[PDB]
Amino acid sequence: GMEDLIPLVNRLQDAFSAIGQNADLDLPQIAVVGGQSAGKSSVLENFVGRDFLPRGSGIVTRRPLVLQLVNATTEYAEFLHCKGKKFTDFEEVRLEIEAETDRVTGTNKGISPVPINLRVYSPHVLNLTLVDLPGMTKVPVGDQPPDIEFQIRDMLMQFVTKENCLILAVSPANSDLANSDALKVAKEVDPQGQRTIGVITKLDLMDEGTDARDVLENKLLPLRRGYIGVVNRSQKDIDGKKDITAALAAERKFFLSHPSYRHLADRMGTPYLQKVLNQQLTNHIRDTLPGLRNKLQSQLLSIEKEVERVDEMLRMYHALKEALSIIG
Ligand SMILES: Nc1nc2c(ncn2[C@@H]2O[C@H](COP(=O)(O)OP(=O)(O)O)[C@@H](O)[C@H]2O)c(=O)[nH]1
């Protein structure tokens, strides 16, 4: 399709996020899922080229982050809920995400599906939007609630059960892929593997004598859209403030050097992943936008005649109208 398609859906995402909605609308979008520590934040920060996501122990993000990367001549960030303000200090971007997590979930330490919408304008990005969802976990730690696993999983299921949700299933290579939370979720909701894109992180950490060639050649657990491997900064690199440019150069050198991957190298790494996701997401929106408009229309007229809480219903009514107006 067209280069207008990702920005179109950004505006849809803003319209529905303004009333605290996203998952129920079945928007064509990429949801990023993984186990905690799979490397999701790292992928997103690689795309942006700056650190901007909360780090530290436990479940630091507890809402969806609708991350909208917009190629632009200038570089800055805007939050939908902070109208007017342009962030150029990505450390303040991170503090604002932390503040939004605390404001909605800080008492319960639970999970909320209410999205945070963050747009990052930059000359260094392709148009690409991803809905980052909290990483899955198994054992509550510290002050986490006893059902934290299910709070997280139930919330991400609200997104990925939707047929227009592409799933960016992030799994670390230094684990048996058969243990992947991301790919388990994806196979539950997408059993034929038609709307799941595999990202394999941490290839630099695999055990000697092993490699992920079978996974990356799409042979171990085939997905129609395949798998892309990436090599992000280690924790030591993060703490040493290694720059992303140097990380990307190390990742390219890794794929060109590794005997098990060098024949795949041009379909590996973070720049390729960004390009592939921009292309598949654009094509995905093209294929699904007409169906979305019908879904939204039907939802709208359902609301109108039921109108014949209702406060939430009227908010949805105006958001749906706004969305249909954006689709035009
Ligand atoms: N060596 C290496 N470490 C990684 C890679 N990706 C992430 N990490 C480290 O894994 C940890 C978790 O990554 P992060 O992106 O925060 O995981 P998230 O919880 O899924 O967002 C951090 O200590 C990262 O520095 C990678 O490809 N290689």
Side-chain angles (χ1 to χ4, degrees):
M2 186 183 317
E3 71 282 6
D4 298 322
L5 292 183
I6 291 171
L8 186 158
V9 171
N10 287 346
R11 294 191 293 278
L12 299 182
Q13 288 167 334
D14 289 348
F16 291 114
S17 176
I19 65 163
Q21 291 288 315
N22 175 292
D24 289 338
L25 295 130
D26 199 6
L27 303 171
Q29 54 189 11
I30 296 164
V32 197
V33 298
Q36 291 276 327
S37 305
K40 282 194 296 102
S41 303
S42 292
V43 176
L44 302 177
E45 286 176 331
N46 281 347
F47 290 162
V48 169
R50 308 216 254 291
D51 300 353
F52 71 101
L53 290 171
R55 299 212 158 253
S57 60
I59 320 296
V60 296
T61 57
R62 294 197 299 269
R63 291 169 63 189
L65 176 73
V66 181
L67 173 64
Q68 297 173 343
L69 309 187
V70 183
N71 179 260
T73 73
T74 178
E75 185 181 50
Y76 62 97
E78 290 177 343
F79 290 90
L80 187 66
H81 67 280
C82 210
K83 270 153 48 210
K85 186 182 187 178
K86 283 152 63 140
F87 288 74
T88 52
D89 179 5
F90 279 74
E91 226 67 11
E92 272 172 19
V93 173
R94 173 174 57 59
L95 280 175
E96 184 68 27
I97 297 168
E98 297 180 7
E100 280 299 290
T101 306
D102 308 338
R103 186 187 58 83
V104 170
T105 78
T107 317
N108 292 62
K109 303 299 187 289
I111 303 296
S112 170
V114 180
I116 303 163
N117 280 36
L118 172 58
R119 185 168 308 172
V120 172
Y121 294 97
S122 180
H124 310 107
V125 301
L126 301 176
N127 280 2
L128 180 58
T129 293
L130 309 114
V131 177
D132 185 44
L133 298 170
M136 285 170 275
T137 191
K138 296 296 171 300
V139 189
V141 304
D143 70 313
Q144 292 169 3
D147 61 340
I148 188 57
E149 169 175 12
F150 313 110
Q151 290 202 44
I152 291 167
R153 197 153 195 282
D154 288 350
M155 195 272 273
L156 66 84
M157 284 292 278
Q158 297 181 239
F159 287 80
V160 301
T161 54
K162 298 303 187 298
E163 290 292 289
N164 295 330
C165 190
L166 293 180
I167 302 171
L168 190 62
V170 182
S171 314
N174 62 343
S175 70
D176 198 315
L177 201 72
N179 293 329
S180 168
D181 287 294
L183 295 170
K184 175 181 165 185
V185 165
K187 211 171 265 298
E188 276 197 57
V189 307
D190 175 30
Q192 283 79 59
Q194 303 297 297
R195 57 182 172 94
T196 300
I197 302 159
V199 179
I200 301 299
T201 63
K202 309 194 184 184
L203 285 153
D204 61 314
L205 300 188
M206 296 194 72
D207 190 34
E208 189 184 6
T210 74
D211 62 54
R213 182 181 183 162
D214 279 345
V215 176
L216 295 174
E217 292 179 344
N218 211 26
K219 295 167 184 171
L220 189 169
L221 276 166
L223 297 175
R224 173 149 182 173
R225 297 163 186 270
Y227 291 78
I228 296 175
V230 300
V231 177
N232 311 306
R233 293 177 303 168
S234 64
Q235 186 61 42
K236 164 199 263 225
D237 297 334
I238 284 179
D239 285 333
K241 275 153 200 177
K242 187 170 183 187
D243 59 88
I244 303 307
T245 304
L248 290 169
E251 166 187 71
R252 177 58 171 172
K253 182 177 183 179
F254 175 92
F255 285 111
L256 291 172
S257 299
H258 194 300
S260 304
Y261 311 137
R262 49 191 175 205
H263 69 290
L264 307 174
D266 285 355
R267 306 176 345 248
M268 299 284 134
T270 296
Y272 179 72
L273 174 63
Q274 189 161 167
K275 180 194 82 56
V276 155
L277 297 181
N278 160 279
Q279 174 197 242
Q280 295 193 24
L281 177 57
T282 291
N283 292 347
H284 180 59
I285 298 168
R286 175 203 57 181
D287 288 350
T288 61
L289 188 63
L292 173 65
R293 168 203 313 130
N294 295 2
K295 296 184 189 66
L296 295 177
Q297 284 164 351
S298 158
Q299 288 171 315
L300 173 62
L301 301 319
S302 167
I303 271 171
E304 303 186 340
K305 82 179 139 199
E306 144 76 30
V307 152
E308 301 296 325
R309 188 188 289 273
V310 55
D311 293 352
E312 258 168 54
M313 254 195 301
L314 292 172
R315 286 201 290 278
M316 178 66 66
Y317 174 83
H318 290 292
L320 294 170
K321 298 202 65 97
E322 182 53 22
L324 293 162
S325 170
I326 286 155
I327 298 173

